[PDB]
Enzyme design. Structure first.
Site, PDB file in Angstrom:
ATOM      1  N   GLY B  25       0.792  -1.214   0.000  1.00 52.51           N
ATOM      2  CA  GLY B  25       0.000   0.000   0.000  1.00 52.51           C
ATOM      3  C   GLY B  25       0.831   1.273   0.000  1.00 52.51           C
ATOM      4  O   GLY B  25       2.060   1.262  -0.060  1.00 52.51           O
ATOM      5  N   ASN B  26       0.128   2.401   0.088  1.00 48.18           N
ATOM      6  CA  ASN B  26       0.772   3.700   0.241  1.00 48.18           C
ATOM      7  C   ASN B  26      -0.188   4.650   0.940  1.00 48.18           C
ATOM      8  O   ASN B  26      -1.408   4.501   0.852  1.00 48.18           O
ATOM      9  CB  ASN B  26       1.251   4.270  -1.108  1.00 48.18           C
ATOM     10  CG  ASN B  26       0.296   3.968  -2.253  1.00 48.18           C
ATOM     11  OD1 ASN B  26      -0.750   4.614  -2.401  1.00 48.18           O
ATOM     12  ND2 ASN B  26       0.662   2.982  -3.084  1.00 48.18           N
ATOM     13  N   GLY B  41       8.889   0.998  -2.498  1.00 52.99           N
ATOM     14  CA  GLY B  41       9.747  -0.138  -2.267  1.00 52.99           C
ATOM     15  C   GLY B  41      10.129  -0.390  -0.823  1.00 52.99           C
ATOM     16  O   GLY B  41      10.438  -1.533  -0.469  1.00 52.99           O
ATOM     17  N   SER B  68       5.946   6.921  -3.782  1.00 53.49           N
ATOM     18  CA  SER B  68       5.102   5.798  -4.177  1.00 53.49           C
ATOM     19  C   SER B  68       4.790   5.829  -5.668  1.00 53.49           C
ATOM     20  O   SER B  68       4.455   6.878  -6.225  1.00 53.49           O
ATOM     21  CB  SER B  68       3.789   5.837  -3.384  1.00 53.49           C
ATOM     22  OG  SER B  68       2.865   4.902  -3.929  1.00 53.49           O
ATOM     23  N   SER B  69       4.874   4.657  -6.307  1.00 54.81           N
ATOM     24  CA  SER B  69       4.557   4.556  -7.728  1.00 54.81           C
ATOM     25  C   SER B  69       3.108   4.923  -8.028  1.00 54.81           C
ATOM     26  O   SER B  69       2.769   5.178  -9.189  1.00 54.81           O
ATOM     27  CB  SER B  69       4.844   3.135  -8.234  1.00 54.81           C
ATOM     28  OG  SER B  69       4.177   2.166  -7.440  1.00 54.81           O
ATOM     29  N   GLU B  70       2.251   4.980  -7.010  1.00 53.41           N
ATOM     30  CA  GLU B  70       0.847   5.324  -7.208  1.00 53.41           C
ATOM     31  C   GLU B  70       0.507   6.712  -6.678  1.00 53.41           C
ATOM     32  O   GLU B  70      -0.661   7.010  -6.415  1.00 53.41           O
ATOM     33  CB  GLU B  70      -0.035   4.253  -6.575  1.00 53.41           C
ATOM     34  CG  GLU B  70       0.106   2.924  -7.299  1.00 53.41           C
ATOM     35  CD  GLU B  70      -0.295   1.735  -6.458  1.00 53.41           C
ATOM     36  OE1 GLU B  70       0.223   1.591  -5.333  1.00 53.41           O
ATOM     37  OE2 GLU B  70      -1.114   0.928  -6.932  1.00 53.41           O
ATOM     38  N   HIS B  91      -4.066  -3.186  -0.685  1.00 52.93           N
ATOM     39  CA  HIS B  91      -4.589  -4.323  -1.431  1.00 52.93           C
ATOM     40  C   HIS B  91      -5.179  -5.308  -0.437  1.00 52.93           C
ATOM     41  O   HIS B  91      -4.897  -6.513  -0.500  1.00 52.93           O
ATOM     42  CB  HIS B  91      -3.509  -5.016  -2.276  1.00 52.93           C
ATOM     43  CG  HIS B  91      -2.812  -4.123  -3.257  1.00 52.93           C
ATOM     44  ND1 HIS B  91      -1.831  -4.591  -4.106  1.00 52.93           N
ATOM     45  CD2 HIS B  91      -2.935  -2.799  -3.520  1.00 52.93           C
ATOM     46  CE1 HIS B  91      -1.382  -3.595  -4.850  1.00 52.93           C
ATOM     47  NE2 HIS B  91      -2.036  -2.496  -4.516  1.00 52.93           N
ATOM     48  N   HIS B 152      -7.176  -4.780  -8.433  1.00 53.22           N
ATOM     49  CA  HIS B 152      -6.126  -3.985  -7.812  1.00 53.22           C
ATOM     50  C   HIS B 152      -6.266  -3.903  -6.299  1.00 53.22           C
ATOM     51  O   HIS B 152      -5.457  -4.490  -5.565  1.00 53.22           O
ATOM     52  CB  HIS B 152      -6.122  -2.584  -8.420  1.00 53.22           C
ATOM     53  CG  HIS B 152      -4.901  -1.787  -8.079  1.00 53.22           C
ATOM     54  ND1 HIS B 152      -4.227  -1.028  -9.011  1.00 53.22           N
ATOM     55  CD2 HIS B 152      -4.228  -1.636  -6.913  1.00 53.22           C
ATOM     56  CE1 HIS B 152      -3.196  -0.440  -8.433  1.00 53.22           C
ATOM     57  NE2 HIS B 152      -3.173  -0.792  -7.159  1.00 53.22           N
TER      58      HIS B 152
END
Ligand SMILES: [Mg+2]
Ligand SMILES: [Mg+2]
Ligand SMILES: [Mg+2]
Ligand SMILES: [Mg+2]
Lengths: 203, 203, 203, 203
Positions: B25-26, B41, B68-70, B91, B152
């Site tokens: 998550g983020n 990561g 975060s990639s999101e 998730h 997702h």
């Protein structure tokens, strides 16, 4: 202080209820013609004994404190069951899933008798905190110590906070058992009334 | 330092989210026209306040840190909901299973109203971190504080980290309820819009 | 001592694997042309660094120590995947249930790509600890970092103990997702190979 | 004191059984021609070594202490299995759900052989604590170290408290596996008797 000890026990019950994966909820004890009950909105981990709310015999809560929004069906439980000294309400996930199907829990396991008979009832839906919901609860608790609430969750009452939490946990186990077996076999095998009658006496 | 306190709270939320079985998550907060967000990561148990990433109002992240990639759909949430101060993405397994079926969560329980209406939406799939996914998220959050993401997981936003985590946990409970009942009965009984309308006002 | 640090990390991984509800199992690292591996029979909570077993490049274990009964498919993993530095084997309940159905996990969630492709394979059954089982494992790991074992459980390998445990946990989440959705809808919706191809590159 | 050490180990087993989500139950060891067993009604967290109950070879319990209401099928286990030194009984939820369906657990996983054969039996229902229930238990344990009890739960016995708890936990895992797969596929694939015969010898 009698009240400080009881409020401490209410909080311990709340924290223990969440630790067992059972909690949203509210907990009360019978006290001086009214009740001591958890307040609305405050997370259990932030409750201090000071925050427990006294409601007198008339439904008037202490000044400056807002009791649980569902205090009215705690009052209904105490008026219906003279043997109830403590009431636990939660939205435990298995209990609540059964209540969404609007099904009672039948006699799938002999520990069903801990609530007083051969079933855990499921009372019809009404808006949380209303008088209509209170009346349904009173009817469901006439001959049972615990009841599901359709689309809502679980009420359990007993002679002590420890016993009410224990019964709440037992009904959640019964609910998980029912869901797990119902997913395989509908209807689920049950014990007959003779078997439950024997168990009820042994209790 | 305002930033140190917020970064400490982000980490506490992350560690608490994993402790509740919700985390992958983020987590972010709205901050100085941009956001503070977890980095990519790094496991939550290894996060230090120093590792939280500031992204300015333009999408430029702090030098030497990879957000975060999101982060783009955190930005989408903040732009869509002026009332959002914190965003939680995870998730969680029950949420994510419902999102794999590409189904919204309907009004199976009155606590559905905590997200603002009679449903938890399920936004259509697009690759994580993309603009296409961001646009779907913005649309889904227009009238709801939380949304599933097909194949997702879950996004929840609220006025505080504590409330966003609480809402994320509530949607995971709703998802578990839906999966548990759907396995028995399809479709699952729901409350009608009058019932939800009553609950929405009580909130 | 290099060996003491690695054995300490193996034990930490074991204790962490049980804490996450993932363990029965065995854990190893690549070491000096052979491996360090948990011993047979000893519960994780009783493991001391002294009890970790070195197996040389020939399959000869240290004198006076009995390695895991499944060391042969750890050796198969290391010979098949030059990038594997650590191997985690367990009988995590959701992984193992899928393996009882003898089904691969398909692309129900984009995190399937963490094992290298669009699937978690399920290798055919053979008796634990046998050469036949080792050969099946080698084939399954040719293009994947993790595999189910029919009627058995899960093998995951990665570049570090932390990453192998993380991947093992991720496959257990994927398995729980698959079981939860399969109980509702058979077959479960999947992402197409274009979607996974995009995700694989982003990784 | 030999008895103090054993009673301490019984309590540790009880507390550990609840920590693993396996407990309601009762635990005993073979001792001096009778047994030491948990008392009735007392929650595990309140057990002190003083509260463990000795029952002699005749079924006469110590004065002033009430043994577990199910001590009679602990006695049945010890009389049936000379190799049993410890007996664990619980109502673990997955075990108990299978027992509600009145199904044995078949050879869905090679660890079924830990109970001595290709199955976990399910003994027919009789009222808890009765002689009829004891006789069913004795028959079920003739060739197996563990058995389900219809509409009731699980009995597991082994050469030590640690091994009996381990076996009880293993049967609960097997039960969860069976329920999870049965919800997808009925009947569940099983290993043939040749496969189990091979595993039994390796044990
Ligand atoms: Mg309620
Ligand atoms: Mg994500
Ligand atoms: Mg194995
Ligand atoms: Mg029993």
């Amino acid at each position: 202080m009698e009240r400080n000890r009881l409020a401490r026990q209410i909080i311990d019950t709340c924290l223990e209820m969440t630790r067992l994966g059972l909690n949203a909820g509210n907990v009360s004890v019978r006290y001086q013609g009214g009740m001591l009950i958890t307040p609305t909105g405050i997370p259990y981990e932030k409750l201090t004994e000071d925050k427990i709310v006294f409601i007198d015999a008339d439904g008037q809560h202490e000044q400056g404190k807002l009791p649980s929004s569902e205090w009215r069906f705690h009052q209904a439980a105490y008026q219906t069951r003279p043997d109830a000294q403590a009431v636990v309400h939660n939205h435990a996930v298995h209990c609540t899933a059964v209540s969404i199907l609007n099904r009672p829990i039948p006699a799938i396991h002999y520990m069903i008798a801990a609530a007083g008979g051969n079933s855990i009832p499921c009372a019809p839906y009404a808006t949380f905190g209303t008088r209509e919901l209170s009346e349904h609860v009173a009817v469901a608790l006439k001959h049972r110590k615990a009841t599901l609430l359709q689309h809502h969750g679980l009420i359990a009452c007993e002679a002590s906070l420890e016993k009410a939490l224990w019964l709440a946990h037992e009904v959640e186990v019964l609910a998980q058992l029912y869901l797990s077996t119902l997913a395989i076999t509908d209807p689920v095998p049950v014990l007959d009334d003779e078997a439950i009658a024997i168990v009820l006496e042994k209790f």
